Homo-oligomer: 181 residues x 4
């Protein structure tokens, strides 16, 4: 079937139909992959507004959104609040331990879960999910392993593409309402 980013396989479209939960990586997926650091200890990161719209569409379209992260950075919390993301696991050695608790807390099967990644630490979780996604400019070794590879880059609208995919496959796209924030 066709999408506004180009055609996708029937298999990928079938996986996208069943997703109840979308897990997102922060750095290199939601952001341009950079961490901005100051002399007085400031730490800034950038998120894509059009990604936000996709995320808010997904949340109003009965798709839950979650984030798994290595270190408890306050900005990610603030960003989650802005978009209304209540599921934020921070300070995570494994992404597997956080992944298991998410499935317990929501009683959702692994095949009903999508994950978007960009580096090799993202894989162990992507191996077990229903739809595994790698961003266009993800690490060369992650790309061939994922079920789907986005056309758009990390922090440039790749998350929007996946949201857009999940909506289309589930036939909620035309009616989906979000905020570009």
């Amino acid at each position: 079937l066709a999408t506004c980013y180009g055609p996708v396989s029937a298999d990928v479209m079938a996986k996208a139909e069943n997703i109840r939960l979308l897990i997102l990586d922060v750095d290199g997926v939601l952001s341009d992959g950079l961490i901005y650091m100051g002399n007085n200890g400031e730490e800034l990161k950038a998120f894509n507004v059009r990604d936000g719209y996709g995320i808010r569409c997904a949340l109003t379209s009965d798709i839950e959104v979650a984030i798994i992260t290595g270190r408890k950075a306050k900005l990610v919390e603030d960003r989650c609040a802005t978009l209304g993301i209540t599921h934020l696991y921070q300070g995570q050695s494994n992404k597997l331990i956080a992944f298991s608790d998410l499935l317990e807390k929501l009683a959702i099967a692994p095949e009903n879960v999508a994950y978007v990644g960009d580096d090799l630490i993202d894989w162990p979780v992507m191996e077990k999910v229903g739809l595994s996604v790698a961003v266009a400019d993800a690490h060369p070794l992650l790309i061939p392993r994922a079920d789907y590879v986005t056309r758009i880059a990390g922090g440039r609208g790749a998350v929007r593409e996946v949201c857009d995919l999940l909506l289309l496959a589930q036939g909620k796209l035309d009616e989906a309402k979000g905020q570009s924030i």
Copy 2:
């Protein structure tokens, strides 16, 4: 029909001939859609100096400039003040309201209004205005709907491109004076 950005249709030029008001979204139009967020609630947005020049030219050549955006930040007011933009609406995802307020306060028919946007949230207003513009890298679903697609990406001089177009259509480009600020 000739512009410094490439050929444009007689229809778009005839539409641009009549613009008394230029409405702009911020994120993905006046910026590349990025939001920088810090660990102490620091927010940063990036604006384009040549977009500024074009806005200055537009305002000194009897064309009003307005802004309607979904987010709300002090920095946006500051940029507005720097450029002499007196009409701004923030924290608004139903953009039809702010738009209707503008049609009242400036006594201006909707077909004398140009609107530049990048996401689907912008379209409700774009459908009603005289000249609707989508930026080169606007969300793929917006692009086919617009009257004119800019050559230049949001945050890189798409606004400048749009200001350039109106001024040329009104015979004002040659003389127009601005400050690249």
Copy 3:
């Protein structure tokens, strides 16, 4: 003759031999064209490190560097302070007034001056210098007016390219010394 950016005309090379002073624009030449603003009135601009190396070379090679800019900004002052740029003109409406005052203060003729600009306000001065330069991604209407059009974009090493050219033209590139700061 040939350079590390591609061949250049005999004329452009001949003009570069005589350059004793290189005037630079800040926005869109030394910067990515962007101005980063914040909620507590913060303002940040980005400068390229390899531009630093070039400016340092030029200054130790009997080529003065000057900047004409429309505002006062401490960040610019600090940038000039880092690279040893003493001649900084701040708050200039016209650039011609600053250009005359620069010419009289240094006892240097118009043909020994080079200017690197990116927008239509740089032209009134660019017209009067020996070597005028528009950066790769300058406003489309400025590009055909310049003597030389850089291969590298504004804020990416365009200034380095112009330093690299001046130096080579004067037989100083091989022996030049700078710091990538």
Copy 4:
């Protein structure tokens, strides 16, 4: 000879096998070369998180990591502290002096040392090491001097590429554990 970024020469792979120390430049190598400066003395620099993971991998796989940079900023110390780089030299433009101190302190030969650079100031050291690396978007004059030129630009994963290269040559890539931070 096959990597995930593409084929490298047999000589480069033999060189990479013997690397026991990796020396990095910061500006233009670990970053895209931009320096963010503000009105209050705020300074920012962007590092690449996937670069971090490579460095973390190199450090945990018996390959020491060191930094010599022309600039001086507390922010760099923060970065090295996060990644675990104990060997750091700032405000050092004659980079040979730090290079001398490094070999002396680690009791290690130059032919076991690898250097990634982006500008000419990086060459006097690069000339002496066993594996010299220019980034994809290094200065045109540095590119042909290096043993190897990365496929990825500085600050987009050029350092990660080199980390992947050493690890592969030393058979340590598959098992290498790091953190994308």
